[PDB]
Structure formats: C-alpha cells, structure tokens
Amino acid sequence: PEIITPIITPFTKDNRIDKEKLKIHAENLIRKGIDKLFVNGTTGLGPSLSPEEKLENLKAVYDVTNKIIFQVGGLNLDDAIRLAKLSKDFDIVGIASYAPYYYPRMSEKHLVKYFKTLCEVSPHPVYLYNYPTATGKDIDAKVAKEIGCFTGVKDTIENIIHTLDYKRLNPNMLVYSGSDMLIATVASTGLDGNVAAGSNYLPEVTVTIKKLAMERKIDEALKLQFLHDEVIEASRIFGSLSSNYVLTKYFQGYDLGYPRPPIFPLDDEEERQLIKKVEGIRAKLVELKILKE
Amino acid sequence: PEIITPIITPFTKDNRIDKEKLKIHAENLIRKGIDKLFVNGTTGLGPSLSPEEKLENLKAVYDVTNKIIFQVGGLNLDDAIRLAKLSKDFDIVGIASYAPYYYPRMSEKHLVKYFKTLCEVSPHPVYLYNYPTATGKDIDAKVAKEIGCFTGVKDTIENIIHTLDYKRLNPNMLVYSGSDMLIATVASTGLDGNVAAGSNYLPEVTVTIKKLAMERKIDEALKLQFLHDEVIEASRIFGSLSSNYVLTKYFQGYDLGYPRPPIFPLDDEEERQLIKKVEGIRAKLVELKILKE
Amino acid sequence: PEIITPIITPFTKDNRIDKEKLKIHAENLIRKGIDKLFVNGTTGLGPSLSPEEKLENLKAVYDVTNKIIFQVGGLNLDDAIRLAKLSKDFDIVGIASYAPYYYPRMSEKHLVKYFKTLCEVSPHPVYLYNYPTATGKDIDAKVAKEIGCFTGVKDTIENIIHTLDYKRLNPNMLVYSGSDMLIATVASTGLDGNVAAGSNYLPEVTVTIKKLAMERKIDEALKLQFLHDEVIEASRIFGSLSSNYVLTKYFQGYDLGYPRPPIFPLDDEEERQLIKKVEGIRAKLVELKILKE
Amino acid sequence: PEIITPIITPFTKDNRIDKEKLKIHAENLIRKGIDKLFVNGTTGLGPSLSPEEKLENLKAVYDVTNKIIFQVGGLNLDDAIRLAKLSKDFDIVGIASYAPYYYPRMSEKHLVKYFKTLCEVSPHPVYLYNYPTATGKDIDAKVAKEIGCFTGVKDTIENIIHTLDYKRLNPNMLVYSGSDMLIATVASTGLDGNVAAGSNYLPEVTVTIKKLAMERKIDEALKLQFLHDEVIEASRIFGSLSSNYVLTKYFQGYDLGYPRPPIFPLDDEEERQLIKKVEGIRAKLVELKILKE
Ligand SMILES: *[C@@H](C[C@H](O)[C@H](O)CO)C(=O)O
Numbered sequence A, B, C, D: 001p002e003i004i005t006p007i008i009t010p011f012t013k014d015n016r017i018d019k020e021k022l023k024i025h026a027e028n029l030i031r032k033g034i035d036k037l038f039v040n041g042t043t044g045l046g047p048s049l050s051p052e053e054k055l056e057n058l059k060a061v062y063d064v065t066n067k068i069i070f071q072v073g074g075l076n077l078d079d080a081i082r083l084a085k086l087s088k089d090f091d092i093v094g095i096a097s098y099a100p101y102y103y104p105r106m107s108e109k110h111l112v113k114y115f116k117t118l119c120e121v122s123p124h125p126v127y128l129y130n131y132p133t134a135t136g137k138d139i140d141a142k143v144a145k146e147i148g149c150f151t152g153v154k155d156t157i158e159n160i161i162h163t164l165d166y167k168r169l170n171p172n173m174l175v176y177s178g179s180d181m182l183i184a185t186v187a188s189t190g191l192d193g194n195v196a197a198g199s200n201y202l203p204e205v206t207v208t209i210k211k212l213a214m215e216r217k218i219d220e221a222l223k224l225q226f227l228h229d230e231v232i233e234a235s236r237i238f239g240s241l242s243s244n245y246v247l248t249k250y251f252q253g254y255d256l257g258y259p260r261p262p263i264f265p266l267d268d269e270e271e272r273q274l275i276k277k278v279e280g281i282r283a284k285l286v287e288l289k290i291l292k293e
C-alpha cells in the first residue's frame, strides 16, 4: 500500500500561489518516501483555486516529480474538462475529482453523467475523490461500479465498511482511505493505502506506520499510529486546514506561507497553544529516532 | 411581508450568461408583484459563477430594477470584498453572502471574521444567507447577533423555530424564510416574507398566498399553499435547479436557456414527464383566475 | 386550537408513582385552562413505565378528568394491545403510541402493521405520536395516510413543513405540534394546537400565547412566545425532563417529587442556578398579571 | 481475538421465551467454536424483554455454558441494579449495559452516573455496549475512560477510528466491534474481536474469517468476509432482526420459533424470497468446505 500526500498550497501575503515554497515542500515529501502527491485536494484548498491556479499547482509540483494525481473538479464542467484535457502533456499517475459540491440532492443520473464526462475526455486514469461531508453527497461502491471508469478512489469518510465495499464491488480498483488515523488498519486489512493530510508535516511517521504494519508488527504500528492520532487531534483544535501550515513549519522546518482566506492563519496565541499540545509528541518521536530533531 | 425571487441565471448554449433573457425574466417578475430580486443565490447557481459573472448578473438585472440584493460570497475572500466594493455605484437594496462552503468544521471565530470583513467593506446593508445543508454550517441567531452587522437574513432550513429565533434575538432584523412551502405560515406568524425559488415560475401564486394570509384568510392561503407545494414536489423529481428552467418556460411562456453543467438541463422526455405532473395544477390556477392563458 | 399537557409523572422518594401529587397536578392544569392531558408521553417518562404503571397513571388522572389521551406504546405489542383494550372502561378522548423505539432500520411494512394492529383493537380514537429523534424513525404524513386510522397526530420535530403536510395529505386529521416554541405560529397558521411540555409549569403562559394568536395580536403573541422560549431554554441547561419538575414547583407552588433514574433529579446547586435563570421572567409575568403570585 | 454471539431469544407462538430452543442454539454455537455469548443484546431483543425475562435468558443459557456476558440495562435503574446483583450467583464472564435509550439530550454527567452506579453494584466485570444509532447517545473512548470501570466495550458503529480509540485511550480494555462486516479487519488490526449478529446463523463462517485473518491470509479472509457481507445484506431486505430467525433455521437446521412483535416474523413468501437470496451463497460455502452438503 502507499502513502499519498494531499499537498498543501502555500500562498503569499498577496494571496497568490507561492511556487517556490511548493517545490521545496514537494521535494522534501518525495525525499522522505511519500509515494505520490494529490494536488488540488481539500488540504491544498482546491475548491478555493481557480482553474488557472489548479494548473499552476500541477506545473510547479511537476517540476519536482511526475508522481501526481491532479484534482480538477468544480462546478463548471467546461473548466474541469479543459483541465482534464490539458493534463495530456504531463506524464502523471492520474486525474481526480470530487463530486460537484454545494448543491444538495443532485440526482444519481446527473452525478454519474458528470464523472463519465470526465472519464471520456481524460488522457489519464481517473480517480474518484469521495468526500460526502464536504460535497454533500456520497458516491458509494455501487455508484462507482455504475460509473465504471474509475482507476481508484480516495474515500474520506468515517466508515471503513464503506471503504472496503469499493474493493468488494470493484476488485481491480485501487482503494485508499482519506484518514491519517487508519494507516495501520488499512495496511493490515488489504487496502491500497492512505491519502493522509498529516503526511504533509509528519511524512516520516506515516511512512513508518505503514512499514511496521506491512511487517506485521501490529502492536508497534498501533503505538506509533496512536501518537500520530494525537497530532491529528491537536491540529483540529484551531482548524486543521490552517494548523497544517503551522505543523509543517514546526516539524519540517520550512514554512508554507499563508492559507487563502476564509481559511485564516492561526494567530500567535493559537500557534503557541498548538505547539504546547505537540512538543511532547515531538520529543517522543526524536527519542524513537523517527524525527532527527 | 415580501416575496423575493432568487432569480434564475439563464445560460446560452455555449455556457455564457444570456443577459437579454435574464432582463426579460427580471422585468416580468417585477411586473407581476415580486418585491426584490436576490441575485446570484443558489437558484441562480451563484457558486457556479466566477466573480466577473456575478458582476455581469448584477449589471443585467440592474438595467431592469434597483430592487436587488446582490450575493457576492465565495471561497476567495479577496474576490467577495472586490464585489462588495464594486456594488457602490449601484443604488441597490443590499449585498449578501452565504457562509464559506465545502470545508467542514470551520470555527465560529473564522466564520465570524469572514462575515465582519464583508460588512467592513460594504457600501450597502448586508444580508445573511443561512443555508446549512448546502454550506455545511449554520450561522444561527446567536452568531448573527455576534457578527452584529446584518440588516436581514434569509434562512433556508426546514425548522421554523430556528428562523423565528433571528427575530427573537435581533428585533430590528428583517427575517425571510428560504422556503416556498412556508409562504402562508411566514406571513401569518409575523416574519418578513420568503425568498422563494418557485416564485421564478409562479410569481402570481406566491404573491397571492402572501396576500391571502395578510388578510387573515388562512384556510384559503393554505389551499393555495398546498397547490404550490405539489409544484415544488414535482420540480424535485428530476432535480429542482434544472427543473426551474422548464417550469418557468411552461408557466411564464418565455425560456431561460440552459443551466450550467453539472446542473444539467432536463432532456425532452423528462420535460414531458415534468409537464404531465403539473398540467392539472396549471388548470386549477387558470380556473381560480390566478393565471391567465 | 388547543393546548394539551403531556403530564409529568411524579415519582416518590422510593421510585413509585405518587398518585396524590399527580391528581393535584392534573386539577391545577385543568383549572388553568389546559384542554386535555396526554398521559405516558415523553414528558411523563412513558418509556420508563411498565404497562402496569402506564395503567396506574391513567386511573389516577381519570379521577380528575375525562379529557385524556392515553399513550400505550412499547416494544411488547401484546402489552400495548392489552392497555388499548383496558382503556374501554374509561371515557377518554383517545389512545396514542409512539413508533417502536430503539431498533433501527425497521421496515415501513412492520411499522404500518404495528399501528394498524393497535387501531384494530382500540375502543377509542388513535393518535399518532410522531417523534423521530427519540424513536429512530419517522411516520410522516404519507405513512399516516397509508395507516389510515389516526384521528390525530402529535408531531415532535423541528420542521413545521413536515407538520403542515399531515394537514395537506389528511384534511380531517387533528394536527398538533410537540413544540412549546411554536404555540403562536401553530395558532396563526391553521394547525390544531400544541402538546407542550412547558405547559406543565406555565399553563397560564401557554394558554395566553394561544389566545393572543387567535385574536390576531401576533406581535403580542410573539413577545409572549419569546419570553416562554427563554424558560424552555433555561430548562435544557441541566436537562429538560429533570428540570420540568423543579420549574413546576417554582411556578405553580406544589411539589411533583422526582423523575425516575436514569432521568436523575436536579441537585441543589442546579436547582438554584435554574431558578436564578427564570426569576426575572417570573417577575415579568407577575408584572403582566399572567401569574398571580 | 474472539467471536462472541449476541444470541437470539426464541419465543413461542404465545410470546414467551422458549427455553429449550435457546439451550439447543447456545449449545450448537459453543460446539461450533463461538467463544462467548452476549445475552439480552439487540439481537436477542433485550429492550423488548422485562427484567424477569432478561434473568430467565441468563438462567437458561447458564445451563449450557458459563461463557456469558449478561446485558442488564434499561430505563429503570433499580431494575438494572437488581439484575446486576442477581448475577452474583452465576460464574459468568461479565455484565453489560447499553446507555439509557429513547430520551435525547441526556447530559454526560447523567450518563456517567448511570454506568458508575451499575459499576458500584456489579459482582462481575462490566462491559460497555456502545450503540449510538439505537440508543441516541455515544459513550466514546474519552467518556469510557471517565467512567473508569469498564473491562471491555462492544462498539456498534461503522467508524473503526472510534473503536480503535477505546484501545488508544484505555490500553487494558477489551475492545470489540459490533459489526459482522469488520471481522477480517478487526482481527487484522490488533482489536479483540467481534460481537457478531450473523454468528447466530453462520458461526462457522465468522470463526473461519477470524482464523484466516489471524494467520495473515488477508485475501482469503476478505473473500470469506465479502461472502458473509452478502448474507448480512440479504438479511436486511425484510428486516434483520426478524430474518436472523429464518437464516438460523436455514443454515443451522433447527428453529428458533418467533421474534417478539413489533419485531414481526417473516411470512412464508418473505422466507422463500430470503432463502433464494442466500442459496447461491450457501453453494459457495459448501464448495469452500465451510458448510456440509
Ligand atoms: C484529501 C485528504 C482528506 O480529504 C482530508 O482529510 C479531509 O479533510 C485531501 O484532498 O486533502
């Protein structure tokens, strides 16, 4: 199974993508063993990016690696098709899309038509990004089977039965969990890996969890998974999407600029409180030799 | 109380806004007794419009009327602030925003900041568009009070206790329900009216439910409310946002072109089946003299 | 429209029904203008009562009045049938049942059969007690129509569109809201009344809101409804079912003993903090001559 | 890890517990390798049982094996205390309780006090039965740690993150999933097993999944798990609690009488239809040498 990072998008204080900070982060993740990078995902604020900015993300990360799944979805199908077509010139792993968001109670037929349209124009394997809480609707294993053209799915949902059903109904699909908390379990249970937001700031931890689980060191894998869970939980206190920038600086040492408002940066008081929640974990990880310092 | 129309956005065959068609629709709404037009709302596919398109919509409708509430919200706060500022040379009723959508679990602090920012830059009264199911979060009476700068609220929620609480906690605030099914009830119970999607295609009915209820003719208001409910229900069969276009052409006699995919137009057969569901209702309304021929 | 009290079941210090206190409570409710008493409801802790105790509550209240709806539902259909049958010697308004609770995913067919079974053996008119949050299932206007034998419905739900639909789909059905916060609205919108927990302790307030709304004094009815809402809200702080006991003694001047654990009594401090939250309101109602003091 | 059966309670035509049938089923389960029996659980319709019937189930099952977890909870705490103190004379594994069900919005303090009360009187280890959808309340790993007296937990929830959390926050606690669909996964990931409704009718399948997973034959375990999932899905067509009876007689060859209405028995036609849905699965199981024929 693989660890895939939904890469954060660094923005400048002028609210533009900071390409040079993006490349440093991408080079580091690849160096520390991350298999592939998911670009324009939730963690990268994809829904806050214009199509031009989605493409800009791909270009900059493509300077570092071709190990990329390129998220192109949105509420203007013509723009999503254009991005899909444009990816022809990049030797990447796949494109992806979440379901059309915001609008409640979209028919099954319309949702299927949306995805099959992307498949029809896609010059690469197409990944489903299933995230019901964010998008307001579910594209479960049976609907995915009906769409019929997915190479893989990232299933972000608090229900592993739901995730296993993709494998059960679609044996040749790649099936990933969107949870950092499930890296040990997913590697234990025959699933294909994790697109793990926490691998932005602790790629070492997520890779080592997966390694230990593969080795069938399940108790050791769980011990480390449970320390990583505490960092995930600390990140959620002030808002994980914002906290991810702070934790990446803290653990990896380079910064990633600002998020894009209304995803606001943590203020000084919030940062201090976040660091006090994780510095002990950071000590344990250095002790364990997972982190250098 | 008032009937406000979240006006449909007509698109051409090639996915641009049909400005002349939008002006015809707007003019007919005003002439048929609609009080204001809520531009770039959900019914208008506001989340699917770039900021420039949001501005185009305001300019087209403004050629017809200044009775406008201009919705400017989005996931790029620099863009919504720009739209808010640009509205200064339009003598309109107000600007509006839904909450930042898609991203789950955004903090009270951050949501509060987003809306206080818009109010800080706004040259007009600001209206809250509260839509928990689409945006994934709720800006209730309490949070509205803490933001402290809203002139009015559109509450799209089935819970009328929730809507009544805006008035309870903010006595001066104008408070509209986002439901077509609650026109008689809103009018009876001391609230300020409805922002009603179905008034796009049946403005005569929604204006008449309001008036009946205003005159304490509750049984009659309800009779007509219950008829209108059947039309809402039929619009949901193939997708209300797509169905609104078909109903407007059917009931009002002019067309509004296409929605924007992934809000896909109904096909011929769905159009036919939709019309069959509402024929006998059209007939009742002609007979009641609410509609002509 | 009516105000109906889902009467509290006072328990003794050794966890038995206090018959004398229940008769004293029932006399006062009837004296103060309450229309009917709903016995073994949620407020009465019906699900915590054995079938014997549910009969005992009926016998006691019936000493005071004929104006009783007798709730008999439970997870043993034979006991519910037996309570239905035993009601034949009581000259009461009707019997009632919530849907079978606890077990999720019960089929529509098995739900219809449970209610049709009770209608088949009932010597009295049958009222639907619809409470989806408590029971885990919804018996909506269309399901009620399918069951076909309800004389009325109490709909405890935060969605008045849902409550209105009972009237729409079943024009002869009596339709009550289970909300205290909706007394002004329900009377202004053509529904039949409220089965209101808060009328245990403020029957005078509930009757007055209803009267003011009936007389079309909506702003007066709201002002009063909004004050009542603050009392409801205070009661939720430490748990409504437990607080109702404390409030009834505070406002009506007699003791109602204890709830039945695990609905635990308020402790001295909770009781003191609660009274502190409503004492300003008690003063205002005295000043308005709604409460005599 | 273990497979624990939440054993069905067989009822006679006249709605009493069929002791002899219960004993035969209990005996067969143990002989087929089931580790422990969970008595008066959801599958055994415990909320539909009086305290006297809960105790009668314990006595009959105790004739067969002492490997019993005795579920005692309900909405009368005195009766649950009584059942707990009565279990003193039985040399069994433990007692258990779900949270007080039906009543929404019970405070954490009241839920804690309910369980600690049962812990203070228990003559055996105490197990948490956590079932949020059925009871309306979640007693999560943090609340479990606060209560402080649980030897183990049965977590009936699809979110395995939530189940792993009990282990994380309470490392000495026995942690079981209530899902039949998570048997391979739970065994793989270092949890203690499953309390599986489907082990009533396919005990041999559930124990083999567990053993395959234990042997790290994940693909083989999943294959069998996926077949087992199809029987669970089939059981849900006409209602799982009712269907469990028909499947047990079908797969195990003896009958378990009747459920207790409103859990109504399947009819002849529904039985025929269910069997036709699982026939082909039975053939697969025979071909895999799990079942004889
Ligand atoms: C995917 C990873 C998950 O969707 C986020 O965990 C959900 O917050 C991504 O694109 O970030």
Ligand SMILES: *[C@@H](C[C@H](O)[C@H](O)CO)C(=O)O
Pocket (backbone or CB within 6 Å): D006, D038, D040, D041, D042, D043, D044, D131, D156, D178, D179, D180, D195, D196, D197
């Ligand atoms: C426990 C087993 C689970 O609670 C169910 O199988 C899911 O409803 C039980 O006691 O039946």
Ligand SMILES: *[C@H](C[C@H](O)[C@H](O)CO)C(=O)O
Pocket (backbone or CB within 6 Å): B006, B038, B040, B041, B042, B043, B044, B131, B156, B178, B179, B195, B196, B197
């Ligand atoms: C307002 C009306 C409601 O928001 C929608 O009708 C709900 O679908 C609007 O902006 O369209």
Ligand SMILES: *[C@H](C[C@H](O)[C@H](O)CO)C(=O)O
Pocket (backbone or CB within 6 Å): C006, C038, C040, C041, C042, C043, C044, C131, C156, C178, C195, C196, C197
């Ligand atoms: C009816 C009152 C409402 O059903 C509950 O108070 C809602 O909590 C009853 O029987 O109490």
